[PDB]
Amino acid sequence: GSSGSSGQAELMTLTIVKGAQGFGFTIADSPTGQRVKQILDIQGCPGLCEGDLIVEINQQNVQNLSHTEVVDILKDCPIGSETSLIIHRGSGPSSG
């Protein structure tokens, strides 16, 4: 790669816990990466707001990852333990 542009943001890490069934929320393949389909356990995903956009799981890069690749990483995750996800938010500053 070469590139030669700049452009930067500050993305939200949130923390989640892997109950038994593979968290208490579901995912969907979107044109933009994986998204939250639906939350099924609020404290299974404290701070998740649905339709948010998966970018990193435990600092692994998963934007360009297929649905399966993201599911697999969430399978690698330990049950009952924390997992740290990073989602897409904050285009620019305004009244927030």
Curated annotation (Swiss-Prot):
Cysteine-cysteine disulfides: none
PDZ domain boundaries: 13-90
Record's subcellular location: Cytoplasm; Late endosome; Synapse, Synaptosome; Cell membrane
Reported tissue expression: Specifically expressed in brain.
Subunit structure and binding partners: Interacts (via its WW domains) with DRPLA. Interacts (via its second PDZ domain) with PTEN (via unphosphorylated C-terminus); this interaction diminishes the degradation rate of PTEN. Interacts (via guanylate kinase domain) with DLGAP1. Interacts (via the PDZ domains) with GRIN2A, GRID2 and NLGN1. Interacts with CTNND2, CTNNB1, MAGUIN-1, ACVR2A, SMAD2 and SMAD3. Part of a complex consisting of MAGI2/ARIP1, ACVR2A, ACVR1B and SMAD3. May interact with HTR2A. Interacts with IGSF9, RAPGEF2 and HTR4. Identified in a complex with ACTN4, CASK, IQGAP1, NPHS1, SPTAN1 and SPTBN1.
Function: Seems to act as a scaffold molecule at synaptic junctions by assembling neurotransmitter receptors and cell adhesion proteins. Plays a role in nerve growth factor (NGF)-induced recruitment of RAPGEF2 to late endosomes and neurite outgrowth. May play a role in regulating activin-mediated signaling in neuronal cells. Enhances the ability of PTEN to suppress AKT1 activation. Plays a role in receptor-mediated clathrin-dependent endocytosis which is required for ciliogenesis.
Illness association: Nephrotic syndrome 15: A form of nephrotic syndrome, a renal disease clinically characterized by severe proteinuria, resulting in complications such as hypoalbuminemia, hyperlipidemia and edema. Kidney biopsies show non-specific histologic changes such as focal segmental glomerulosclerosis and diffuse mesangial proliferation. NPHS15 is an autosomal recessive form with onset in the first months of life. Disease severity is variable. Some patients show rapid progression to end-stage renal failure.
Family the entry assigns: Belongs to the MAGUK family.
Name of the protein in its database record: Membrane-associated guanylate kinase, WW and PDZ domain-containing protein 2
Native organism taxonomy: Eukaryota, Metazoa, Chordata, Craniata, Vertebrata
Residue numbers of the full-length protein present here: 600 to 682 of 1455
